[PDB]
Structures are given as C-alpha cells and as structure tokens.
Design an enzyme around this catalytic site. Structure first.
Site, PDB file in Angstrom:
ATOM      1  N   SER A  58      -0.735  -6.630 -19.166  1.00 45.25           N
ATOM      2  CA  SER A  58      -0.887  -7.296 -20.478  1.00 45.25           C
ATOM      3  C   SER A  58      -2.293  -7.466 -20.971  1.00 45.25           C
ATOM      4  CB  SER A  58      -0.152  -8.630 -20.542  1.00 45.25           C
ATOM      5  OG  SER A  58       1.245  -8.419 -20.485  1.00 45.25           O
TER       6      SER A  58
ATOM      7  N   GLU B   9     -40.317  20.958  27.120  1.00 48.89           N
ATOM      8  CA  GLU B   9     -40.163  22.398  27.072  1.00 48.89           C
ATOM      9  C   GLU B   9     -40.612  23.136  28.294  1.00 48.89           C
ATOM     10  OE1 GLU B   9     -37.997  23.906  24.999  1.00 48.89           O
ATOM     11  OE2 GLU B   9     -37.760  21.821  24.320  1.00 48.89           O
TER      12      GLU B   9
HETATM   13  C1  LIG Z   1       1.846  -8.629 -19.190  1.00 51.58           C
HETATM   14  O1  LIG Z   1       1.014  -8.954 -18.360  1.00 51.58           O
HETATM   15  C2  LIG Z   1       3.328  -8.595 -18.854  1.00 51.58           C
HETATM   16  C3  LIG Z   1       4.039  -7.397 -19.496  1.00 51.58           C
HETATM   17  C4  LIG Z   1       3.505  -6.021 -19.093  1.00 51.58           C
HETATM   18  O2  LIG Z   1       5.434  -7.454 -19.173  1.00 51.58           O
HETATM   19  C5  LIG Z   1       3.974  -9.929 -19.265  1.00 51.58           C
HETATM   20  C6  LIG Z   1       4.643 -10.633 -18.086  1.00 51.58           C
HETATM   21  C7  LIG Z   1       3.850 -11.918 -18.010  1.00 51.58           C
HETATM   22  S1  LIG Z   1       4.352 -13.274 -17.182  1.00 51.58           S
HETATM   23  C8  LIG Z   1       5.954 -13.772 -17.729  1.00 51.58           C
HETATM   24  C9  LIG Z   1       6.993 -13.383 -16.679  1.00 51.58           C
HETATM   25  N1  LIG Z   1       8.351 -13.458 -17.189  1.00 51.58           N
HETATM   26  C10 LIG Z   1       9.127 -14.505 -16.897  1.00 51.58           C
HETATM   27  N2  LIG Z   1      10.382 -14.421 -17.013  1.00 51.58           N
HETATM   28  C11 LIG Z   1       2.750 -11.825 -18.743  1.00 51.58           C
HETATM   29  C12 LIG Z   1       1.438 -12.473 -18.548  1.00 51.58           C
HETATM   30  O3  LIG Z   1       0.693 -12.631 -19.548  1.00 51.58           O
HETATM   31  O4  LIG Z   1       1.057 -12.820 -17.404  1.00 51.58           O
HETATM   32  N3  LIG Z   1       2.958 -10.894 -19.659  1.00 51.58           N
END
Ligand SMILES: *C(=O)[C@H]([C@@H](C)O)[C@H]1CC(SCCNC=N)=C(C(=O)O)N1
Ligand SMILES: *C(=O)[C@H]([C@@H](C)O)[C@H]1CC(SCCNC=N)=C(C(=O)O)N1
Lengths: 595, 598
Positions: free
Chosen positions: A347, A41
């Site tokens: 799911s 200062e």
């Molecule tokens: C849930 O996770 C979904 C839902 C919202 O449609 C379905 C899709 C699958 S995997 C099967 C993909 N289809 C094949 N042709 C799941 C899952 O449990 O992973 N559930």
C-alpha cells in the site's frame, strides 16, 4: 593515509585501510629476516649478492593481503613491528614473495606451513639458526594476529555505506586513494535512527515472546556482545531469580522483574502464558543475553530480535541522506536493507498511482468506484473483503481499496504508471507490465520509496538521493563538491541545478494533504503526512512519511519472508519507529509543510 | 616505464611491462565511455549525475585486470587501442570490469564477460545514452580481443628470460613494475653463437636418429609456433616424390624429394629404417610438419624439431660473470632453462676434481695407479667397457675414465675432503651422498655448477660465484646496484678476493692434464683444456672445457632419462657444440692459459 569518513557535523566516524607500505631502513632489519629471505630460494646468480638486491625490494615486495614490504606484512598478519617477529614468523613472510596467494597463511594455511618449515630447514642447514631455534620455530603454530584495518565503530551503517558503494562502482583502488569523504549524514539524527530501530525491533520481539537461549552447553568465549546485549552463561536457577557468568568472570543475578516478560513464543500469532517460575525460562548451562541499567546495579534478560528492520531519512529538497540504518545491528552482517533490501511495498505504492489520477483531473473529493472487479481471470479483492461503492478518492486511499487502485490503473494506463514509478525512482525490470503493480507487488528498495515520497514533500520534483557532501585529498584540496538537483532553489537561502518536475504542483500538494489527513485520523506536530503498508500474509510492515524538511521510510520484516503475524500491520510495527525518529529529529524546528 | 634488460655492450634485448597507467584529461574522454560507467550499476547514491562528477577522480586509477590501471591502460591491454578508437561494445566491456576484474575478465571468463557487457549495453539503451541502432550493432559485436605482448623478448630469449624469471622467483611480480634497467654480463656476440651452436648440435643428433613422424596429426595449425627457423605446416596433398603443405600465412608450398629424401624412419635409439623411396612413407594428409626456407626463399625442406635437449653455459673464470646461456633447443619450444634448473648426473666430468685432490696429496700426472677389479663392501664398481688396464699413470686413468682408479683415489683422498670440494662450487650437502659412488659422477648437478667447478682449474684454484648482473639503474638513470664479485685475480682486470679452494700446483697440473686430453686425445688454439662425460646407458653427453678467459659447459640428453644410443658419447654429442661455440667465441683473442704460483 586511509580513506576517512566524516558526518556532516565534522566528526570522523570511519577509517578504511587500503594498500599498506611501511618503509624501514636496511640497517633496521633483524638479521634473521634477511637470512630467512636468503634461505627462501635454492640458488641465486645475481649469498651476499641477493642481500644487495633484496635491499632494493624489501619495502615494495607484495606479501599478500594489501601488504607491500616486510613491515606492512608484519603489521597486517601479526600486528607486530619487524623486531617483534619470531624466527617462524620471519620464515612465514620470506616464503610469500614467490606466490603470495598460493602460500598465504590466511587462505592456504596447510600449503604455507609446508613452505615455512622448509625455509626453517634450509636456515638450519646454512647455519643461520641453531638446532634449538629450529625445534621451536617448526613447532610454532600460524599465530596470525591480524588487526582490523576497517575502523567503523561509531555509526556503522553510515561508514559501510561509503566503503561498500565506493568499492562497487570504482573497485578496491577507491580505498587506496587516502581521501576524506564528507557525508550528508546528520550524527544526531543517525544516533536517533539507530536507537529507534533497535527499540522498535525489540518491542515487536518481546510481544512475540521468548524463543529460548541462543545456545546450550557451548563456550561463552565463542559469543560476542552487541546492541547493548551481553552474552552470559546460566550457573544457578532459583524460583524467581537466576545467576549468570559474564564474559569478564563476574557473577550476576537477574531478579523476577528482569525476566517476567518471557511468555514463550509459539508462532507469530501465538504466545504461551506468562512464566510462573525462572525454571520455565532458563536452564543451567544456557547462553542468554543480558542488559544492565545505566548504573549497572540491575540486569535484565533480553533477546536479540529475529525480525529485521531499516530506516532511511532524506532531505526532500536535495535528496541528502540524513540517516540510514540497514538492520537491527551492524555486527550481525554488513547487509544494508535500506540500499539492498528488495521487498514489496504493498500500500505504500498507492499514493504514487492515486497522484497520477489527480494528474488526470480528479480531486481528493472525486467519487471512485469500490465495487467488485474481474480482469481476465483475476478478481482483485479488498483485504477486508468488503465493497464501499462510490467513495471519495481520499477515503479510497486512506482505506487502501484494491478495486479502486485497479480501476484507477486502467483510467490512467499501465505504461503511464510504470513510467511514473521509473520517474519516482523504481527499477524498469523490477516493474511488471501487468495490473498487480497497483497492489505493490513489484520489488522496491526503501531508498526508492523515500525518493518517491519526496515528490510530495517538495512540490512534484524528482530528487536523487546522495551521501557525499564533499571529498578532499590527503593534502586538503577539495576535489569534489556535490552539485545536487534542487526541488526549490530559493529554499536553500531560507543553488545551480534545478530538479525535473514529475507531477503537477497541485497533484503533489493534494497528495501531501491526503497523507496529512491519513496521519491525523490515526506526536505534537501538524506538518506531517504519511502512509502505512502491509504486504500479503503480513510479510512486510512499512511507514513512508514526511515533513517539508525530512522524508522517512521505515520497514519491518523477516529476511526469509514468514508472516510478522496477523495484527502486525504497517501502523503497528513500522510506524512507532518512524514516530520515535521523527519526533526527536524534528524536535524544536518550526512547522515545515509544502510551499 | 618497463623493466629493461641489456647486454654487456649496452644494447637493449628485453622489455618486461608490468602494471600500466596512461592518465588522460577528462575532456579527452568520449562521452559514450563515461555513459558506459554510468550504466554499469543499477543504483548510485553518491539519473547518474554525481557518479559522472566522481568518476573523474577514479578514471585513471581503476584496476581493470591484466595489469591495467585506468581506462587508457585497459584499451591498450585488451584491444591495442586508444580510448577514442574503442567501439561502444568495447567501452561497455571495460565498464563491466571495476566490480570484479577477475569474475568478469574477458581472458579468464569470456561468457561472464559477454553477459555483463550486454547487460550494460541494455542499460545504456534504457537510459537513452545509445540509440537502438547503436545497441543492435553493439550486442551482436563479438569480444574482439587484440591483446599486445608487453613481454618483449625476441632477440636472446634465454638471456632475457633469465633476468625476468630470476627477479620474479626471489622478489615476485613487484620486480617487473619497478621499471629498473638491468645491465647484464651477457656478451651478445657470444649469446648469438651459443644459440646457433645448440640448434645445429641438437639437429645433428636428431638427424642421425631418424624421422619420428609429424609432431601432430589432424590438430589446428594455429596451435603451433614458428621458432629456430622452422615453420609449422599442414600436409594437404601427398604425391609420389613431393608433398603440398599449408603455411600459417595462408599460402601453400611444395617440398620436393631433395628436401625429404633424408627421412629414414626411427626404429629405436640404436636403429634407423630403410631410406624412403616415396612421399607416402614419410607423410599423410592432415599431418602437422616443420619446414625450413632458404637464404632468400625459393625452396622449402622437411625439417624436424629435436626431441633431444641440450644446453650451453659460458662463464668468465676470473669473476664468475655469465657471458652466454642457452637453456634448451629453443625458448619458444620450452621456457625451461636446463643450465640453471636441469639437475643431471655429470659422470666423468666430476673426475678431474677428485684427481686434482689426489695431486693435492702428493701424486703427479705420472704416479702409477691400479685399474683392476675392486669390491667396497657389498659394492663392486665396474669399468664401462668391462676392461681393466692394470698399473697405469693417473692422467691415462683420467683420460680413459677408469672407475676402479676413481674409487681407489677416493679412498686415498677420503669421501669428506671430496664432498667439501664438491660443495665449494654450489653443490648442496643433500645433493652429494656420503658414499664411494661420488667418484663415478652419481650426484645430481646443474651445468652452472660444473661451469663454476671448471673455472677453479682455469683461474688457479679459486672459488668464483656465477653472476648475471653487472649493474642496476633505476628508471631515472641512477646507479642503484653495482656488482661486487669475488675476483680470483684482482691485478688481472677491482676489490673482493676470491677464496682459494685448491692448491695452485693442483689446479695448474689438472689444467695441463685437461689440455693434453684436448690436444692429443681428440679449432686453431692451444690454450684449451677439457673433459668429456657419458653417464650410464648414455643418458647424458657432457663436455666441460676452458681457456683462461672463458669456461663453457655443454650437455645433451632427454628430459625424461632415456638412452642417447649405444654409439653416442660426450665426445660425439656435446663436444661438437662446445667446439663450434669456443672456436667462434674465442676468434681473434690472444692465447690465454692458467698462471702458476708457489
Ligand atoms: C496495503 O498495504 C494493503 C493492500 C495491498 O491490500 C491494505 C491492507 C492493509 S491492513 C487491513 C487488513 N484488512 C483487515 N481485514 C493496509 C495497510 O495500510 O496496512 N492496506
Ligand atoms: C664417464 O662419463 C664414464 C665413466 C664414469 O664410466 C666413461 C664412459 C665413457 S664412454 C667409453 C665407452 N664405454 C662403453 N663400452 C666415457 C666418456 O667420457 O665418453 N667415460
């Protein structure tokens, strides 16, 4: 006096430094420091008078960056004792009192040096310093050697969980308390979860292929080691081998078996052919990541995954967080995906809505309609594009039939479900008022999913996740003891607050047994139940499962949603992490199903 | 426990409140306030049961912005309330602060503050902590800040501010939070006299120079402050001989012709227009004017806040104690302290120092000196009046301020000896050039330094240091600092000896020259010495003077260097303030003059 973090096994895992003050006796102060303040200062009307009044504040003066007093500033900014400071550093500190944020060497280095040099110039004029001292001092750079006051190198996500949550709810003063926080974190289970997520993400990563070196012709010094990956510079490339320079100056060789996995990544759904030579994988001057074996007698070419993941494990009886992993590795960023990672459950939301169908009188054996459905304009289709007609509720869940979930939503009502999702843990303004909520489109946090799955493991009660067991002050007084809401009070005995019931006992047990059947119709345990989840375009892979003593939710996805790839469903990407963690966490514990 | 400021008679003049914390028992907390903290964040993982239990640990410590630590400190700081007097909305406001006390602050960001508060109120409703009736009321409710002033300085503002600003300048904001009791050297009687002498002095100059119009036109009246017994008013109606004005209290007053007839228009620093005959010539509706009441009230008059500035600095010559300090017209007009920080050229007030050094070399007040043209290299110093007196005594040259004599004496004394002495009273090496202009009072100085300089004549040749603190007492009454000044004369009061910077006979002969200048060259006292100053184009008016117990320096001028006018001189502008102060400050004190020693 820092904020200390312990695991439930009494191991100190983290230390967080708050406001720092290190008092020194006045006669311990190097003469040049007092002079640097005397010369900071233009004039004093309190030159020997400032000396007497400086002595009353020298230990209290706010010097920015949590530094109160000269010694704390020396420590925070330079990791030095007041004796170790140079003329230039002493003048840098002496310039901060006036405005510690405007003159700060961290935030305003340009403005700071302007102040430091002037004080040095005023030190020279007063005869405090020689012309030679002044010439070196003025020419000296910032020389900041700021130590880390956040020690968190054992279970990083567990330590940070405490610091970040305290600061969010109580602000920065929460650290300044000096308290010992005793968490619900099991250190063995935490160590398992950390390893499992790391292995799970790498397994996904390797099958998706080699993405090339992270950098080329850039300095090795600019990279850092983490998750048992070590930066290295390629120096020589041979037909079946390569040579690399490590961060310690040693040269290592990576033989064929160490890099042969390196099929080139093309996209999430495509890898090139197995490499036929080392030259297809690496270039000289490339920055690669190597991993040694236990003996350090062999090295492999590794890769940090670009994909992310998390794990959360809670006790379903009380909601105690036993383990938490917020990403591949904490060095990447402090971001915790278990607590802040808002993603669509898909799911994994289905057992919650199907448990509400069970509340209304349906059984796992009741027939449900998997036939085409159209609501307004919307046609909810099945992921396989097939319709199974009249099927049992349990088969409809196991196969995740969207039309059934949509039909179940009407039969049970939206508000009734939204309320249950809110009961299960889920956020009111994150749960839409439409029919897509039967498909897992609302955003959720993995911790909310863990909380909801606990309703099945505990018999229908709402538990609240918690990470603090107890808090002590610095003196040893217990100032906080967790009083959680228990699902089952007599189960603690093998006490006070009873958790609220959110589902009938029978709906919870019925759902638990469907999930056990879902797990057994794909380790060596008969007391597990779980559900997979995959979002649209495989943007997310989940596994939400449990036993009666532990609920675990795993997730895998990219932070910027991009597909994980077709073939990358819940059961493929997330489930192995769950299996690896669960198998080791529940090893040598008896069967524990639902009461 | 705030920083407390006291006058030499142990009377409290200022209170500066720093960081605040008012701890409360957890049972004393309204449940709605705890609920507001529970609704502050979406997710708690310590439905907000455990956070309520943990909250108690932090409730009196949480930093809430604007020096507030804990809920009660926040309620006081933002609303001047106790926690049990806050509305649901105000509770939601404070609960929004912990996360980012500067990103959500109602003072700094009122829109972000409002957005956060309403979100919290919304969550309190969703969580069932508040009824829809309570919510509807709460969201519509405005911010309603009612911030008390915790910087109490309404008795001797420049005295109180000296301590606060100086402790902060050297030690930062921790100085205020210390809770220390600062026992100053300030004489309350004298400080009171100083304030009025400066106000009267500046109002006298201001008036002689004419009405410069209302300070504002069509601007909000709430944006002005009353100070120096002047109240901001809005002209609402202009009549032929009078005008109606709106006062800040909400009342309306009439100023008659008597209180506005003076208003001759300012043409320039040397010209005033024709006396007005009607109100329209002075004011317009929507104008922001300053009015002055009476001893009781009854009548208001149109006054003017001076554009011109001034200062006063009074110090004890024996130990350098600061007795009285006025940094400008009024501290509420300007926080700036011109005594301590107002760098100006002293002009002729620097001359006694140079003339004292010529006496040091063997000359007397009678030694003949040549007031005649002189050329020093490419420089020709001229006398302000363009007149040359020839061979005259040194004292006449000093009284009449002969620049040519000053330059000749600077040659006899030498620039270096002169510069060394200038430095002996706080003057920086950098602030004093190594040329012959120093004789003409060209270096920039502070009034506090000139005061220190004049105390060398008053005390007998000694160097004293200006000091404003006698002692410092901690919050718990313990003496933590006692002033140890350098005394010019120790038997005269009790330890440190001041360094002699001038020969006793030189200081004593100068003091008597200055006494002669004041008794025959211009108060019922004969123990006074003094010198006037007027810089080129009258950009500064100075008066430095003393008796053996008090040294006073007064200055008048514009902050932006501008002429005070052709007719303005130190003797006309600064000297009347000095007179008014010294006469009153020295009343009932026996004669006090300087001591001679061989
Ligand atoms: C849930 O996770 C979904 C839902 C919202 O449609 C379905 C899709 C699958 S995997 C099967 C993909 N289809 C094949 N042709 C799941 C899952 O449990 O992973 N559930
Ligand atoms: C001192 O301030 C100056 C000197 C340095 O030039 C002189 C000038 C005056 S005023 C005399 C009128 N001059 C114009 N014709 C003074 C003074 O102190 O008032 N001293």
């Amino acid at each position: 006096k820092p904020l200390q973090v312990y695991t439930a096994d009494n191991q100190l895992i983290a230390e967080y430094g708050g406001k720092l003050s290190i008092p020194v006796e006045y006669k311990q102060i190097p003469p040049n420091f007092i002079h640097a303040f005397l010369a900071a200062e233009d004039s004093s009307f309190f030159n020997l008078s400032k000396e007497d009044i400086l002595s009353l504040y020298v230990n209290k003066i706010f010097l920015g960056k949590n530094a109160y007093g000269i010694a704390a500033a020396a420590k925070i900014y330079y990791n030095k004792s007041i004796n170790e400071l140079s003329i230039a550093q002493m003048a840098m500190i002496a310039g901060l009192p006036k405005a510690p944020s405007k003159y700060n060497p961290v935030v305003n280095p340009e403005r700071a040096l302007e102040r430091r040099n002037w004080i040095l110039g005023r030190m020279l004029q007063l005869g405090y310093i020689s012309q030679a001292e002044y010439q070196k001092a003025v020419a000296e750079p910032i020389n900041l050697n700021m130590p880390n006051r956040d020690l968190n190198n054992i279970h990083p996500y567990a330590g940070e969980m405490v610091r970040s949550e305290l600061v969010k709810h109580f602000g920065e003063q929460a650290i300044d308390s000096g308290y010992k926080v005793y968490t619900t974190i099991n250190a063995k289970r935490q160590a398992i979860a950390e390893k499992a997520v790391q292995d799970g993400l790498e397994a996904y990563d390797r099958r998706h292929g080699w993405r090339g070196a992270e950098a080329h012709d850039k300095p090795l010094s600019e990279f850092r080691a983490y998750a048992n990956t070590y930066p290295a510079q390629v120096t020589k490339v041979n037909s079946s081998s390569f040579e690399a320079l490590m961060q310690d100056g040693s040269t290592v060789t990576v033989q064929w078996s160490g890099m042969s996995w390196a099929r080139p990544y093309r996209n999430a759904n495509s890898v090139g052919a197995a490499p036929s030579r080392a030259s297809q994988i690496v270039k000289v001057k490339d920055i690669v990541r190597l991993r040694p074996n236990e003996a350090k007698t062999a090295w492999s070419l590794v890769q940090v995954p670009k994909v992310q993941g998390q794990l959360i494990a809670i006790n379903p009886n009380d909601g105690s967080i036993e383990a938490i992993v917020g990403g591949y590795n904490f060095y990447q960023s402090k971001f915790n995906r278990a607590l802040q990672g808002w993603r669509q459950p898909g799911s994994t939301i289905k057992p919650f809505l199907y448990a509400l169908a069970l509340e209304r009188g349906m059984t796992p054996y009741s027939m449900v309609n998997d036939s085409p459905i159209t609501i307004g304009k919307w046609t909810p289709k099945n992921s396989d594009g097939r319709y199974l007609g009249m099927i049992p509720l349990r088969r409809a869940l196991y196969l995740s039939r969207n039309t059934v979930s949509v039909r179940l939503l009407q039969t049970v009502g939206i508000e009734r479900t939204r309320q249950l999702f809110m009961d299960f843990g889920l956020q009111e303004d994150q749960i839409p008022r439409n029919y897509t909520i039967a498909l897992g489109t609302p955003q959720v946090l993995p911790i909310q999913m863990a909380t909801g799955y606990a309703t099945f493991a505990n018999g229908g009660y709402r538990v609240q996740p918690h990470f603090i067991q107890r808090i002590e002050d610095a003196y040893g007084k217990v100032i906080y003891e967790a009083k959680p809401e228990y699902a089952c009070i007599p189960c603690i005995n093998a006490q006070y607050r009873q958790a609220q019931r959110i589902l009938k006992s029978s709906s919870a047990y019925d759902m638990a047994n469907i999930l056990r059947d879902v797990i057994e119709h794909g380790i060596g345990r008969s007391d597990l139940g779980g559900k997979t989840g995959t979002t649209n375009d495989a943007k997310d892979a989940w596994f939400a499962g449990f036993n009666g003593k532990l609920v675990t939710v795993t997730w895998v996805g990219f932070d910027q949603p991009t597909t994980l790839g077709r073939r990358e469903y819940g059961g493929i990407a997330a489930l192995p992490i769950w299996i690896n963690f669960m198998g080791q966490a529940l090893q040598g514990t008896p069967a524990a199903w639902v009461r």
